[PDB]
Amino acid sequence: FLPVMKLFDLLYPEKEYIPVPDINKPQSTHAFAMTCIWIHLNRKAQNDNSKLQIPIPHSLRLHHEFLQQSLRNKSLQMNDYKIALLCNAYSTNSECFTLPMGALVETIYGNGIMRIPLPGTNCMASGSITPLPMNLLDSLTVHAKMSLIHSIATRVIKLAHAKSSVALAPALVETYSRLLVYMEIESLGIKGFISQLLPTVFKSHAWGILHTLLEMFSYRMHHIQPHYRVQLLSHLHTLAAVAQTNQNQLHLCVESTALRLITALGSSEVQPQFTRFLSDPKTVLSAESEELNRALILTLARATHVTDFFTGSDSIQGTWCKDILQTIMSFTPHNWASHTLSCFPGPLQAFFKQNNVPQESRFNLKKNVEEEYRKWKSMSNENDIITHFSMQGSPPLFLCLLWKMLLETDHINQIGYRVLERIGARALVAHVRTFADFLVYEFSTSAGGQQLNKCIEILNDMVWKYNIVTLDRLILCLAMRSHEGNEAQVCYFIIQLLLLKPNDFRNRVSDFVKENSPEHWLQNDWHTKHMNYHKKYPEKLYFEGLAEQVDPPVQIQSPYLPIYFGNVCLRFLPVFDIVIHRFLELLPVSKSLETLLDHLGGLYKFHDRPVTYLYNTLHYYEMHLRDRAFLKRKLVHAIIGSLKDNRPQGWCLSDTYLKCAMNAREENPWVPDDTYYCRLIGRLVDTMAGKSPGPFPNCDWRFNEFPNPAAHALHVTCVELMALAVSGKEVGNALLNVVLKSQPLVPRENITAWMNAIGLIITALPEPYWIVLHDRIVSVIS
C-alpha cells in the first residue's frame, strides 16, 4: 500500500492546510478520502509501532483535527454525514469503531423503545421503522458496509435463536434489502444469504424470520444472478416439502414466492441454469403443487421461443427439456388446453400430444358432489363428520359441498370450519382445483340470469366474507385449467366477473395505487402507508370471516407472521400476467381484456419488470396479435401509461410515437416514415456510443430490470417496433432501408455503429421481422 504516498504527493501540492468542507453533502465524504487512507496506514503501522510510523502531512492536519474532534464528541446524530466519515475512517479499529457503529445501528434496530404492531393478530415487532437512506449507504466504504452486513446478519441469527415472538424491525429488513443490492460485498451478501443465513433459519425452525426473508426476496430484490435464483427455488421446494405447513400464511408465501421466481426467469438464463440441475431434476420442481409446474412449463415455452432454441431441430429428445418435462409428467399428470398448446414450440407440442392423461366426466363429478352432500345432511356425529369429509386420498369435493351449503342454506354449521382446519393448506389447493372444475361445469349448466348473479355473489362471499380462498389462488387455479371451447369461455368469464362485478378488489387496487409509489429505495415512510392500507382493508388468512359467521362463533387466536410488504394487490400481479396471456391465447374474449386493462391497469405501476413483460408478451404472441392491432395497442398503452407518473418524460416511447400513435383509428393507421426509424436507431447508437445529454434520462440501474442503459434502449425500442400497427415485413424492410437506402441523419464515418444497432434490434425481434434479410440477399444475388 505504500506507493499511494507519491501519488498523494503528485495530486496534492500545497503549502497550507486544506479547509474542511460542508458535512451536509454526501460527496464531502469524497473530500476526506486521503485522510482516511492516512488513518488506515497509521493503524496498520501501529503493528511494530515505531518501525515505519506514518506521520500525517501538513496539508491533512486540519481534516485530521476535524475527525479527532468529531470522534471526541459523544452527542452524535444521523442528521449530517459526520457519522459516515467516522465509520469510514475508523472501520479498521477495534474499539474506536463501535462509537459510530452502535450510533447508526441503534437507529435501525430499535432496542428498548416500544413494540409496534404488524397487521393481523398477535404481531409485535421492534420499534424502529425508518431505514438508512440510500446516499448514506452509498457514502460509506466497502468495509463499513461489510461490517454493517455482518452485524445485521448476526442480529437476525441471534433473534432466530431466541425463539422470540417479537418480530424483526421494519427498518432493519428495509435496510438489509437495500444493502443486498451491492454486488461488491458479494461473498458477505446474497451468497451468505442463501448459502448460510437461510439454511440456518430453516434449521432453527423459526417461521417468523423465514417469512420475513421470503417476503424481502419476493418484494425487494431486483438483480439476482440466476444460479442464486434457481438455488432459492430449490430451497423453496424443499421447504414446501416439509414444515407441516398448515400455516396458510407460510404456505401462501412460499407458493407465491416460487411463482414470482419462475415467471421472472429471463429468456436466456433457462438453458445454462437448468443444465446444471439436470441430473437432479426433482430439486427444482414442485411435487405437489401443479400450478408451479405449469408455470415452469410456460416459462420454458417462452424461453425456448424467444431465443429460438428449437429451430435447427424438431425432436425434443437429446435435449435437457426432455428430462424436466418427463419429471413433470410424474408427480403431475396434467393435460394442456388446445388454445394454450397451439402457442408452444413444435417439440413441446409433439411431447404433449402424447402423455395425455384422461380426466373425469362432468356428470360423474356432479354425482360425487351430490353423494357427499346427502351424506353431510344425513350424518350427525361430529368427529365422524370431521374424519370422513377430510379422509386423505378421498376425492376432494369439500369446497363444492360448501358451495352447495351456502347456495341455499346461506350459512355454514359449526363443523365445516373444523373440517377445514383439519384439512390444512396443502390439500386445500387440490380442493380449490376440483372446485374450479365444478365451478365451470355448474356455471356452464346454469341459466344466466338472477341465479347467475346469485352464484357470483356467493363466490364473492366465499372469497371475502368467509375467507375460504385467497383471490389470486382461486384465479390462478381457474386460469390454469384445461378446458376447451365454450367451457373455457365460461371460465374466463368467471375470472372477469370475479375481478369486476364486486367492489371488493377494485377498491383495494384503486386505494393502493393512489396512495403508494414503487420507488422503495427513495421512500422512508413505507411502513406508515402500509399500516394505513392494512388498517383500511385487513387481510385475513386463517378463516376469520368463517370463524365469525359460524353460529357458535369460534374464537381463533392463532399468531400471524410478520408482514412488511405483502398484500393482495401485490400477490395478484404474477397471476394477472398469466391471466392476460390466457386472454390473448383465446380468441373471442378480447373485450374482457380491454375492460380489465381499463380497470386494473394502473396496478402495473408496481410490476417489477413491465418492459420485459411486454417484450415477452408481444414477442411470444406475435402470431396471434398480427390482426388485432387495437388490442396490442391497448395493452402496451395501458402497461406503459400506468408508469407515466414516476418515470421521466420520454423514458420508453419516442415522442413522435406519443404524438401520432396515441390517437384512435379512423381507418387511417399512422404509417411511419424513414425519419421515424432513423430516430429510433439513433437513440440506440447514442446510448451505446455514450452521450452526455443522453437520449434517455439516466436511472439507477441497481434498481431496474435492465442492467445497463443499452439493454434498456434495446428493449424499449423492440417493444415500440412490435407495438406498431404495420406488419412485420414493412418494419423489417424499413429498418434495413435506414442503412441500405441513401439517407441523411445517418452519417458516413459512423456507419458501422448504425449497422450494429440494426443487427441488435432486428435480431431481437420475432421471425417475420428478421426474415426479410434473406429476401434482400436474393434481391442482390439476382
Side-chain angles (χ1 to χ4, degrees):
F1 308 102
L2 303 171
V4 70
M5 294 178 182
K6 188 50 62 284
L7 201 58
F8 163 72
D9 197 350
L10 174 63
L11 308 169
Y12 283 86
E14 273 90 6
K15 283 289 302 173
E16 81 290 343
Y17 299 114
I18 299 168
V20 185
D22 178 75
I23 298 306
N24 297 330
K25 301 292 162 198
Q27 62 186 358
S28 299
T29 310
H30 300 269
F32 273 69
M34 66 312 284
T35 83
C36 312
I37 290 176
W38 218 264
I39 295 162
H40 282 75
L41 284 188
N42 288 148
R43 286 299 181 273
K44 170 59 76 168
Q46 278 197 336
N47 317 98
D48 305 335
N49 47 305
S50 158
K51 191 219 60 186
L52 309 173
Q53 204 266 8
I54 308 300
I56 47 170
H58 186 278
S59 298
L60 304 178
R61 204 183 143 274
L62 210 59
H63 305 255
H64 191 283
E65 274 164 293
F66 184 55
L67 289 176
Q68 284 272 31
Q69 296 153 33
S70 44
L71 182 52
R72 187 48 61 163
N73 199 323
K74 307 285 178 282
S75 299
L76 78 175
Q77 320 90 11
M78 313 307 130
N79 45 358
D80 305 347
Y81 299 105
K82 226 185 270 185
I83 180 74
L85 287 159
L86 263 52
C87 298
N88 295 9
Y90 305 103
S91 163
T92 43
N93 258 325
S94 86
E95 281 287 349
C96 292
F97 196 29
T98 82
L99 188 160
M101 188 66 198
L104 89 159
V105 167
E106 281 295 313
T107 58
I108 71 172
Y109 205 92
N111 277 131
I113 303 105
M114 202 179 72
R115 281 182 286 102
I116 193 72
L118 316 174
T121 83
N122 313 292
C123 285
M124 270 299 185
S126 298
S128 46
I129 77 156
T130 182
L132 304 174
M134 270 318 282
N135 47 5
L136 189 76
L137 295 176
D138 287 316
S139 49
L140 302 193
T141 77
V142 56
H143 207 153
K145 277 193 275 311
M146 288 201 280
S147 48
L148 182 45
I149 279 294
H150 196 244
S151 67
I152 292 176
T154 52
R155 297 301 285 282
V156 186
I157 282 162
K158 286 305 154 286
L159 187 47
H161 280 284
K163 275 76 68 179
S164 161
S165 157
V166 174
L168 262 186
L172 190 71
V173 286
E174 177 88 25
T175 305
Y176 192 26
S177 68
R178 285 163 179 199
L179 284 173
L180 286 188
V181 156
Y182 294 88
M183 72 178 185
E184 68 269 38
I185 54 184
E186 161 76 14
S187 65
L188 262 292
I190 312 101
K191 167 94 67 191
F193 187 95
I194 303 159
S195 297
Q196 284 183 342
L197 178 54
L198 213 51
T200 62
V201 175
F202 171 63
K203 183 160 293 317
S204 177
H205 319 305
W207 329 119
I209 300 307
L210 187 68
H211 189 274
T212 69
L213 299 197
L214 298 185
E215 196 170 318
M216 193 181 55
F217 194 83
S218 284
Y219 299 88
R220 294 284 191 261
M221 289 281 132
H222 287 287
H223 278 278
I224 317 296
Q225 292 181 358
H227 38 74
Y228 301 140
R229 202 187 321 262
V230 188
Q231 285 185 0
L232 202 48
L233 196 60
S234 66
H235 288 85
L236 294 174
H237 282 325
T238 73
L239 163 72
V242 303
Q244 62 268 7
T245 54
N246 64 341
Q247 305 167 292
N248 307 315
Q249 200 180 342
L250 173 69
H251 157 83
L252 165 67
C253 167
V254 63
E255 209 175 345
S256 161
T257 289
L259 186 45
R260 259 165 183 269
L261 288 190
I262 285 160
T263 75
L265 269 174
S267 66
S268 159
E269 297 90 297
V270 163
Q271 166 177 349
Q273 277 320 298
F274 278 97
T275 178
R276 322 297 311 119
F277 290 84
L278 201 47
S279 309
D280 44 345
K282 175 60 175 67
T283 316
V284 307
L285 319 178
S286 157
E288 279 69 30
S289 47
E290 169 188 352
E291 307 92 359
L292 298 180
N293 279 334
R294 292 174 95 113
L296 184 53
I297 291 177
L298 293 171
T299 293
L300 258 290
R302 71 132 168 94
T304 50
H305 183 105
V306 158
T307 57
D308 288 332
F309 171 62
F310 281 134
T311 62
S313 299
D314 215 7
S315 43
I316 202 165
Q317 313 279 349
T319 60
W320 51 270
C321 317
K322 189 59 178 70
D323 207 288
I324 299 288
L325 276 163
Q326 189 65 43
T327 313
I328 296 160
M329 284 315 113
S330 62
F331 316 138
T332 34
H334 77 271
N335 42 122
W336 279 109
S338 69
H339 59 270
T340 307
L341 213 59
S342 45
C343 278
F344 275 7
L348 268 82
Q349 285 184 358
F351 177 80
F352 279 96
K353 267 216 187 83
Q354 40 191 65
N355 301 109
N356 192 2
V357 51
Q359 73 276 341
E360 195 183 357
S361 89
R362 300 148 86 259
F363 271 107
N364 277 326
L365 170 83
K366 141 92 167 180
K367 295 322 148 197
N368 216 324
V369 167
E370 275 314 297
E371 279 169 18
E372 288 310 299
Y373 196 52
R374 56 91 188 166
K375 194 177 308 174
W376 188 274
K377 312 169 309 193
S378 48
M379 196 198 331
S380 316
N381 176 271
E382 286 82 6
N383 62 276
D384 300 358
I385 285 294
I386 296 167
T387 297
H388 172 81
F389 285 82
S390 66
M391 296 170 314
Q392 292 80 76
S394 57
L397 315 178
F398 188 70
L399 267 59
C400 324
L401 266 280
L402 286 201
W403 170 269
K404 296 283 288 199
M405 283 170 202
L406 54 87
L407 162 72
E408 44 90 17
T409 74
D410 301 334
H411 314 293
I412 303 96
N413 45 7
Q414 198 265 338
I415 317 107
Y417 169 64
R418 299 291 195 201
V419 186
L420 282 181
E421 186 177 341
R422 193 176 173 182
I423 279 170
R426 289 172 174 177
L428 207 64
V429 292
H431 288 250
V432 181
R433 193 171 302 129
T434 72
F435 182 68
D437 295 36
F438 167 75
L439 270 174
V440 73
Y441 153 68
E442 267 285 341
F443 263 84
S444 175
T445 57
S446 51
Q450 304 308 84
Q451 202 59 71
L452 183 71
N453 321 317
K454 169 77 171 174
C455 305
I456 201 66
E457 201 38 67
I458 64 173
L459 194 75
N460 190 255
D461 295 346
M462 277 189 57
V463 166
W464 306 110
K465 184 216 259 181
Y466 294 132
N467 319 121
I468 316 177
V469 298
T470 317
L471 187 74
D472 50 347
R473 182 68 63 209
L474 176 60
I475 282 178
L476 175 64
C477 278
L478 278 168
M480 277 190 173
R481 292 293 91 201
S482 299
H483 292 255
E484 296 290 330
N486 44 25
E487 285 90 6
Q489 300 167 48
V490 171
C491 181
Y492 300 143
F493 192 40
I494 282 170
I495 281 178
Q496 180 215 357
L497 293 181
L498 189 63
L499 285 171
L500 293 190
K501 291 296 290 184
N503 283 60
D504 296 334
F505 201 57
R506 287 184 280 121
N507 293 340
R508 302 180 160 89
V509 163
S510 50
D511 200 292
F512 196 54
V513 304
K514 290 180 179 69
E515 275 70 53
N516 292 257
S517 288
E519 311 97 311
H520 67 83
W521 56 94
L522 286 174
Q523 287 191 331
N524 48 4
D525 48 311
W526 160 250
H527 190 282
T528 304
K529 294 188 292 301
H530 182 230
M531 282 317 137
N532 289 167
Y533 172 83
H534 267 265
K535 274 199 309 188
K536 198 173 178 186
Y537 298 94
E539 314 306 340
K540 305 178 171 77
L541 271 76
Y542 288 112
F543 310 104
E544 285 76 1
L546 194 61
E548 199 267 349
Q549 302 220 358
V550 153
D551 313 324
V554 171
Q555 290 335 287
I556 183 54
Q557 283 88 359
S558 161
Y560 268 49
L561 282 173
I563 301 168
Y564 315 117
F565 311 106
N567 39 358
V568 177
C569 321
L570 304 191
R571 268 207 316 284
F572 179 60
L573 215 48
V575 176
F576 192 37
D577 307 348
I578 284 161
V579 153
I580 288 176
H581 286 356
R582 299 294 97 86
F583 277 108
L584 293 183
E585 271 159 341
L586 202 65
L587 270 298
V589 286
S590 314
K591 65 184 74 64
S592 48
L593 190 58
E594 297 153 9
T595 184
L596 272 170
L597 291 164
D598 288 325
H599 287 205
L600 308 190
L603 182 52
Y604 268 90
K605 186 199 290 197
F606 303 96
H607 201 280
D608 46 354
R609 45 187 67 243
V611 195
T612 319
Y613 178 61
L614 274 176
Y615 181 73
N616 290 6
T617 307
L618 308 162
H619 197 282
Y620 181 47
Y621 291 100
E622 201 265 331
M623 193 189 283
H624 281 268
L625 297 165
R626 190 170 292 170
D627 309 85
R628 291 179 276 167
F630 179 71
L631 183 64
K632 153 170 61 166
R633 266 186 169 219
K634 169 80 79 184
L635 176 66
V636 63
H637 294 150
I639 289 184
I640 287 308
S642 176
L643 281 160
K644 72 194 175 51
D645 39 4
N646 317 103
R647 320 175 89 104
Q649 160 64 233
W651 71 287
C652 166
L653 297 152
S654 61
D655 51 356
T656 174
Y657 184 88
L658 294 172
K659 294 167 181 175
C660 310
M662 293 318 264
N663 272 323
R665 177 166 52 92
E666 55 265 24
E667 197 67 25
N668 299 293
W670 158 68
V671 191
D673 45 347
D674 307 66
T675 308
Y676 176 58
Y677 302 103
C678 283
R679 197 82 44 83
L680 282 191
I681 305 176
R683 291 198 317 175
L684 182 54
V685 302
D686 276 346
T687 60
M688 270 173 62
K691 186 66 180 294
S692 38
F696 295 95
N698 209 353
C699 191
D700 195 359
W701 309 116
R702 284 171 316 169
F703 301 98
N704 255 333
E705 63 271 20
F706 306 118
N708 47 63
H712 176 64
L714 176 71
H715 277 46
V716 304
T717 297
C718 289
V719 163
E720 170 164 353
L721 291 175
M722 285 184 290
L724 288 183
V726 187
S727 168
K729 195 179 75 210
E730 292 89 334
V731 167
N733 280 298
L735 289 194
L736 263 70
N737 290 5
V738 175
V739 149
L740 263 303
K741 281 196 170 314
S742 178
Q743 260 283 145
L745 276 56
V746 178
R748 204 169 87 242
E749 68 81 30
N750 213 6
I751 194 52
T752 313
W754 285 74
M755 291 188 183
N756 190 21
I758 291 177
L760 289 166
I761 284 174
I762 210 174
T763 310
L765 283 192
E767 169 75 79
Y769 294 82
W770 50 265
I771 206 55
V772 306
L773 182 68
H774 297 169
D775 306 337
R776 206 68 78 104
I777 291 153
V778 163
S779 164
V780 80
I781 275 285
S782 84

